[PDB]
Design a protein around this ligand. Structure first.
Ligand SMILES: Nc1ncnc2c1ncn2[C@@H]1O[C@H](CNS(=O)(=O)NC(=O)CCCC[C@@H]2SC[C@@H]3NC(=O)N[C@@H]32)[C@@H](O)[C@H]1F
Length: 264
């Protein structure tokens, strides 16, 4: 109830002013009061012929949010930055598309990391789509294909209470950021995202280096839950050129393209 006072609406006109124009790759930005899923919405635009490259859709509230492989994403009004962007990908070899999602996580982390007074333990990226802080999930990322595009979706907990959405969640507010400004954070996020997408498109080695530098997974003992329910336990060693997680399982290398990681 008290957090409602900490949740003013986004300023669409201001965001457009900052993010659309010379020197920016963003072509269109809309803030909607509510939708089922920003990712579904941009996918639908693309399916009906729209050019969604550089298009940004932000929702104040999202009622049927999607997580990875069939799961959901929970939100309440004005508690998160909930957005999707369109990225033309057909010019880039399909092998490299995995890195687009890792790039997005890096952009989200970099957009908020300074806001914390002192970095609590376990602040960084958990493979393949998670921004963690103090062991809690601060943001989740979802990439979906609609040729010639990928739709990249970000759900970032700004004032969202864990009790409102998930026991393993956290938020900037719950990390001690007393009055987070979503307008400032959204602008920072989209500027970081633009740079990382450009790096991805040009196979810039700094993208992988920067990802490794913020990885909480690399070097850690992990249990990885694979699609289909199997678990593999090992030590995460690296990410390969396809964005896949390279596991050491007692001297054998197991490369995982998709799965859920638990740090042990
Ligand atoms: N708030 C929330 N904060 C933190 N955690 C949470 C939370 N709402 C649930 N869990 C938990 O996360 C689980 C899903 N996690 S996941 O499989 O790794 N998927 C993701 O993290 C990707 C989420 C992408 C969300 C964005 S929001 C804008 C865009 N449009 C969409 O519909 N999706 C993307 C879910 O089953 C629930 F367990």
């Amino acid at each position: 109830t008290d957090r409602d006072r900490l949740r003013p609406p986004l300023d669409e006109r201001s965001l457009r002013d900052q993010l659309i124009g010379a020197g920016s790759g963003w072509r269109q930005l809309d803030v909607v009061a509510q939708t089922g899923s920003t990712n579904a919405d941009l996918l639908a635009r693309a399916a009906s012929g729209a050019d969604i490259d550089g298009v940004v859709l932000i929702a104040e509230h999202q009622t049927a949010g999607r997580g990875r492989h069939g799961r959901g994403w929970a939100a309440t009004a004005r508690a998160q930055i909930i957005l999707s962007v369109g990225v033309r990908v057909v010019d880039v070899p399909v092998q490299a598309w995995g890195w687009l999602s890792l790039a997005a996580g890096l952009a989200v982390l970099d957009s908020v990391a300074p806001l914390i007074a002192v970095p609590p333990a376990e602040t960084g990226l958990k493979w393949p789509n998670d921004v963690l802080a103090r062991g809690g999930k601060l943001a989740g990322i979802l990439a979906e294909v609609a040729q010639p595009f990928v739709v990249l979706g970000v759900g970032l907990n700004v004032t969202q209470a864990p009790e409102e959405v998930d026991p393993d969640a956290t938020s900037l507010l719950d990390l001690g950021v007393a009055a987070p400004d979503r307008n400032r954070i959204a602008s920072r996020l989209l500027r970081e995202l633009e740079a990382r997408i450009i790096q991805w498109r040009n196979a810039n080695p700094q993208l992988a280096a920067d990802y490794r530098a913020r990885s909480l997974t690399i070097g850690s003992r992990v249990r990885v839950e694979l699609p289909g329910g199997q678990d593999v336990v090992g030590i995460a060693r690296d990410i390969d050129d396809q964005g896949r997680l390279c596991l050491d399982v007692g001297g054998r290398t197991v490369v995982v393209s998709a799965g859920d990681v638990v740090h042990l």
